[PDB]
A paper describes a structure:
CLC-7 is a member of the CLC family of chloride (Cl-) channels and chloride (Cl-)/proton (H+) transporters and is expressed in the lysosome and the resorption lacuna of osteoclasts. In the membranes of these acidic compartments, CLC-7 uses the large pH gradient to catalyze the uptake of two Cl- ions for each H+ released. Unique among mammalian CLC transporters, CLC-7 requires a β-subunit, osteopetrosis-associated transmembrane protein 1 (OSTM1), for transport activity. In this study, we present structures of the lysosomal Cl-/H+ exchanger CLC-7 alone and in complex with its obligatory β-subunit OSTM1.
Reconstruction of these particle images with twofold symmetry imposed yielded a structure of dimeric ggCLC-7 at a resolution of 2.9 Å that enabled model building. Each protomer of dimeric ggCLC-7 contains a transmembrane domain composed of 18-transmembrane helices and a cytoplasmic domain composed of an N-terminal domain and two C-terminal cystathionine β-synthase (CBS) domains. The second constriction (1.1 Å minimum radius) is at the luminal entrance and is formed by the side chains of Lys242, Glu467 and the backbone of Gly241. Together the three constrictions yield an occluded state for the transporter, sealing off the external and central Cl--binding sites from the cytosol and the lysosomal lumen. In ggCLC-7, the Glugate (Glu243) adopts the ‘up’ conformation, where it participates in establishing one of the luminal constrictions. Within the Cl--conduction pathway, non-protein densities that we attributed to Cl- ions were resolved at the external, central and internal Cl--binding sites. In the ggCLC-7 structure, Gluin (Glu310) on helix αG is located more than 15 Å away from Glugate, where it extends into a solvent filled cavity between the transmembrane and cytosolic domains that is continuous with the cytosol. We modeled this non-protein density as a Mg2+-bound ATP based on its shape and a comparison with the ATP-bound structure of the isolated CBS domains of CLC-5. In particular, both ATP and Mg2+ directly interact with the N-terminal domain of CLC-7. The well-resolved head group allowed us to model the density as a phosphoinositol-3-phosphate (PI3P), which is a low-abundance constituent of lysosomal membranes. In contrast, the alternative conformation adopted by Phe510 in the ggCLC-7 structure widens the pathway sufficiently to allow water molecules to cross (1.4 Å minimum radius).
Numbering used by the authors:
A (entry chain B), B (entry chain A): 85 to 431, 460 to 691, 700 to 787
């Protein structure tokens, strides 16, 4: 959709240098590479769990400090100023914390804004958003989520965990820090995009597991996002990482909050225990659940749609960082004022959202007055909608669950009245169902969310109902608007590939999808020609088919290989011309950041030399016939994580190039 | 490995007829095909659950009848004959039930022998074992498992559920019964191997879910076996089927055993509830668990190895059906005698294995004397080893879990003695760990088994230890011998593709793997030539590349398509010669069973005619370069479920053919 975004080189080039390295590795007499992958996955899990522990502990302590300071100060300030004076003071306190958070996000690292989940979804899809995996981004994300939660915004701390795990996985796998310019001479074999994308999948799964105490759910989330060929080894490693993440979080928290290692804190949010007779559903109740799904599908849409409009306003008028900070402060102040009006009219805004969700799930039937619960539902709905897109590190999972739990507990109260206090009409069960439905409507997650809800709930039997609502919420929701993360991905104009091609696509063939004419390089090519092709500012192609150079062959453009701009740049830098032989490490040294063609200097004498690309080109590029259905091209492209696909004639002559933007256009 | 086994045509041929059908389907103005897939998955789940209910209820009633008959008869027979007389009578009773079961297996349908899991694994791998999915096979399997369990063999009823679900999925999806020669004019679009293999995956997942009450575990089992490109839609449907299977089983059983629908019977085997303080592991205990894994890895090997030798004897000397029935009777009699000696020396053989496993898991610390528990462990180990390969419908999961639980509860008793009755040294927790370790050693299942154990246990926290043991059991076990299901697959000589190619395979290239010379067909081909190629009894190739026929092109064997023996047979039958136009249904009519080439009659005048294969050939065959690494060929072959892969020159001239046996040879 936009050229700002490049793509990962997931499909490794099995060139001659790579095969030489593999021969030496096999001769090594021991395959330590897999053991190193395992050690890296363990470290990823441990570090993600420790990040979750840090956030939880710091948030708890700072929230306690805010509560203590205001509890001490209210007497003094209300004695003379009055209630309104204390209202203003507390609102300014919240605004100040949110101000620091929004400053660090807008003025230092705007990528840190939000949960990070859309960015990680794009990364696992195969698109590289500029600063998603950086040390600065992780630091800003963690600090900002702490400051946002302490600042009393309608936000949650679960979402940033996925992004933090992804960044940790990308970082520690390399063995070196580009930001700190420190190289630890380890894990050099894993300085390639394939291994990095595997480790990031592990890290995202670990983040989900630490967030919700849902290991299998995290594994399934990573599998969904990747949408690749099945690798038993990688899935098992991801499972290992997720398990260690949840284990580390639980153990450390148990040692902290309690004085024993007994495991009672699987995740950052813990729903509770639902193993009771009152929380048992009958077949007669299955239709009822489905209906709530419809509701969650509609309300969710109304959420997303509203945000869309809000987002546009922010793109039009709140583009500036200073205005962004001011808007975040204003939202925080209005949230505080709504809370005060709430609290003084009633006789949860001060309390954590997770505790409110738990109480809604498990409190006895007569706990809540319907009127106040509905007021909270409406106000929190509109506040969460007005908070998602702010330049603050925050998530939307817990807010969505809270909204759903509230209106589900209202539905349960109404059912209990209508059914004369029946055991089957228990408000907490319907609160859980409503939480699932609202989260599904706002975010269209199906398998991973079902498994996550089952694990957090702790019951496997509740999965079948949770499934049916999550189904319906999607089916109804997709009727009106697209999902939140998708919506923001479209707005950012990222080239995003969906699970499958548009249904009416068997009509289309690669001939329509492919791009022509194609810029190709002869196997033995003049240095000047390569320099001119790469130096062109009209286009910034990063993959070039390598065609026959000998005059003997009949083929006009017979496909011999595919080479990349990065490899050509390395070769030109090292002046590897036919007129010290490179090793696969020499290419890995440039990684991740490759010098621009402008940097390389090629003298007119050197411009007349030649480059032989046979030793460095990918000898075997993936190829499709020109008369091939679009679904097949899409399936092959997505499954293998290809960056370039070559469309050829019957005679194996290059006729076109299919890339990510070629397949993303149709929708 | 052997030519007795063909392969599924999972990769659909997007020929002209298929595209015409898709255009008409799109013009239909409503896509009911997906809705029909959903309805079929729901029916699969319901029917699998009902099969599980039938087996459970019938087994319970018949076991009660046996217990009542013997309880009444022992007084009368022991009064005059003595204890030995009653011993003989009861042994003969068990032998008679096992005799009926073994007769129906050996003399009617030998495929029904065993769990069916190896056969379903092969089917999902892509190999077609002759009678795996047949009505007769399902009937025999269910009856035989009932008779084996009622006959007191060291067997379990869980394993046949996977096979039964697979057969149901294959059957009801077609809309017609070949065995009963009845056609219900429904589900005609799904009479192709792709849809059948998807439905069978759903059915296998449903079987696992009904067996262990583990929906997600069943989904993961199916995903592991398929090892294909990720399809969100298919995975979601499989999840739907598994959930409905467990729900139906639980609901029906609750209505039967209780008088209320309250859900308390998720699966055929139910471990129990482990949410207690005594069943809580510490970090200090993590190493201990690992050690037990090693034990489970070693013992499991000793199991498998022994069976191997036994299997050989049975292949050499107990090949005959009558001898097979006699051997099953002898094993049953020896099992009964061991039970009697057991029972009279002590003062579980009469009791169900599942109840014994549950009691071992949950009974209080002082329940079992170590001496008798060890005697049972050893005797049951050797009896289960001597029972797995019998011509009786049976499984090995529950026996393995029982063995592991027994020696794990011995390990826990020893730990309690050594640690002076510590709370951390609780025998039941170690019994669960030992069950997992022994099952892992005997069967090398890693992810699906971990998730299944977590769900059956009901605790997510126990997964991390259960993982570590299951890891170690595999790593140690693979050091000595291969897994049981694998071992039997090798012995049957089925061409089985593993998850990845041998590690030292980058050295090999398609040129080594591919088969030459290749038998190809010109696009316009003489009918006599096709008849001769298909009539050859030297080879039975089922896939033929279609090369250029026009003299104009330079290519000697330019690849234009791929056609199949079945399609050619249909065309010859309908005399579709250039010298009524077929519809995609006409090919589906022959499916599943295609007439042999011998059946078709072609007159000498017709032999001189021509066939144009363009409208029917697969216009776009998957292709790889001759200079391509074996890992890549293997990855593409396994991910896309290909039956044929064409290896071509730089000029796109056919040079070789890679099939399943080509890639399975290297090991
Ligand atoms: C108690 C909390 C635990 C905190 C853990 C923090 C670790 C994760 C982290 O916060 O990051 C680590 C930074 C890397 O950050 P980094 O700024 O250098 O980012 C580059 C680069 O910038 C690319 O960015 P780009 O693609 O945009 O060009 C990007 O892709 C690429 O993945 C990155 O390596 O240090 C390290 O490596 C860690 C040293 C590992 C060696 C010891 C192993 C034992 C564990
Ligand atoms: C309460 C217990 C529930 C019992 C359910 C039993 C249903 C499953 C079953 O036991 O099987 C059904 C048989 C098919 O057995 P079948 O012998 O004809 O086998 C052929 C053939 O033989 C191929 O065998 P092959 O490949 O070796 O040549 C094989 O692949 C291919 O899948 C098979 O269709 O009847 C049916 O279709 C069911 C009618 C469905 C229409 C109503 C839909 C509403 C539910
Ligand atoms: N060698 C080539 N010859 C002609 N067109 C090309 C070539 N490579 C890419 N294109 C086309 O140019 C357009 C822009 O491509 P771009 O330069 O972004 O490729 P890229 O950056 O390598 O792709 P990605 O960033 O997704 O890996 C695409 O629509 C693509 O079809
Ligand atoms: N058209 C062909 N020309 C030459 N050799 C072939 C051809 N097709 C298959 N072979 C080779 O013949 C051997 C036996 O093949 P077979 O006849 O079993 O193929 P098939 O039955 O179509 O394969 P499958 O049963 O696995 O689908 C294989 O090792 C294969 O490489
Ligand atoms: Cl974000
Ligand atoms: Cl959140
Ligand atoms: Cl979020
Ligand atoms: Cl079997
Ligand atoms: Cl079993
Ligand atoms: Cl089994
Ligand atoms: Mg680009
Ligand atoms: Mg064959």
């Amino acid at each position: 959709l936009s050229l700002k975004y490049e793509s990962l080189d997931y499909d490794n080039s099995e060139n001659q240098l790579f095969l030489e390295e593999e021969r030496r590795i096999n001769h090594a007499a021991f395959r330590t590479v897999e053991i190193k992958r395992w050690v890296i996955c363990a470290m990823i899990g441990i570090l993600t769990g420790l990040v979750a522990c840090f956030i939880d502990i710091v948030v708890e302590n700072l929230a306690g400090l805010k509560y203590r300071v205001v509890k001490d100060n209210i007497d003094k300030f209300t004695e003379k100023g009055g209630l309104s004076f204390s209202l203003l003071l507390w609102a300014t306190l919240n605004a100040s914390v949110v101000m620091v958070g929004s400053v660090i996000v807008a003025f230092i690292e705007p990528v840190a804004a939000g949960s990070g989940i859309p960015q990680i979804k794009c990364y696992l899809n195969g698109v590289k958003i500029p600063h998603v995996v950086r040390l600065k981004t992780l630091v800003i994300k963690v600090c900002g989520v702490i400051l946002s939660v302490v600042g009393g915004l309608a936000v949650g701390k679960e979402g940033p965990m996925i992004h933090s795990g992804a960044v940790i996985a990308a970082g520690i796998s390399q063995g070196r820090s580009t930001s700190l310019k420190r190289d630890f001479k380890i894990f050099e074999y894993f300085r390639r995009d394939t291994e990095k994308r595997d480790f990031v999948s592990a890290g995202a799964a670990a983040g989900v597991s630490a967030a919700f105490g849902a290991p299998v759910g995290g594994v399934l989330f990573s599998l969904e996002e990747g949408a690749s060929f099945w690798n038993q080894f990688l899935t098992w490693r991801i499972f290992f990482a997720s398990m260690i993440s949840t284990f580390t979080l639980n153990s450390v928290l148990s040692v902290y909050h309690g004085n024993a290692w007994d495991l009672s804190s699987p995740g950052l949010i813990n729903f509770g225990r639902f193993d009771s007779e009152k929380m048992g559903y009958t077949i007669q109740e299955i239709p009822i659940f489905i209906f709530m799904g419809v509701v969650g599908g509609i309300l969710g849409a109304l959420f997303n749609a509203l945000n869309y409009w809000l987002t546009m306003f922010r793109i039009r008028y709140i583009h500036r960082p200073c205005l962004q900070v001011i808007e975040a402060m204003l939202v925080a102040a209005v949230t505080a004022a709504v809370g005060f009006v709430m609290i003084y009219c009633s006789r949860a805004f001060f309390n954590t959202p997770e505790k409110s969700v738990v109480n809604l799930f498990h409190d006895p039937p007569g706990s809540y007055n319907p009127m106040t619960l509905g007021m909270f539902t409406l106000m929190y709905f509109f506040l969460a909608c007005w908070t998602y897109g702010l330049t603050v590190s925050a998530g939307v999972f817990i807010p969505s669950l809270l909204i759903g739990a509230a209106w589900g507990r209202l539905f349960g109260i109404s059912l209990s009245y209508l059914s004369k206090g029946s055991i089957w009409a228990d408000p907490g069960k319907y609160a859980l169902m409503g939480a699932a439905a609202q989260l599904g409507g706002i975010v269209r997650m199906t398998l991973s969310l079902t498994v996550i809800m089952m694990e957090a709930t702790g019951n496997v039997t509740y999965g079948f109902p949770i499934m049916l609502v999550l189904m319906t919420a999607k089916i109804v929701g997709d009727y009106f608007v697209e999902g939140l993360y998708d919506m923001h991905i479209q707005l950012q104009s990222v080239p995003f590939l969906h699970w499958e091609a548009p249904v009416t696509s068997h009509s289309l063939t690669a001939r329509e999808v492919m791009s022509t004419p194609v810029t190709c390089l002869r196997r033995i090519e003049r240095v000047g020609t390569v320099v001119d092709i790469l130096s062109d500012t009209s286009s910034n192609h990063n993959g070039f088919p390598v065609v026959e150079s000998n005059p003997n062959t009949t083929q006009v453009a017979g496909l011999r290989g595919l080479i990349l701009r990065s490899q050509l740049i390395v070769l030109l830098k090292h002046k590897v011309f036919v007129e010290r032989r490179l090793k696969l490490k020499d290419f890995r040294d440039a990684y991740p950041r490759f010098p621009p063609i402008q940097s390389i200097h090629v003298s007119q004498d050197e411009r007349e030399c030649m480059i032989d690309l046979s030793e460095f080109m990918n000898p075997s590029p993936y190829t499709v016939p020109r008369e091939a259905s679009l679904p097949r091209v899409f399936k092959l492209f997505r499954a293998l994580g290809l960056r370039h696909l070559v469309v050829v004639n019957n005679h194996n002559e290059v006729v076109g190039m299919v890339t990510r933007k070629d397949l993303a256009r149709y929708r």
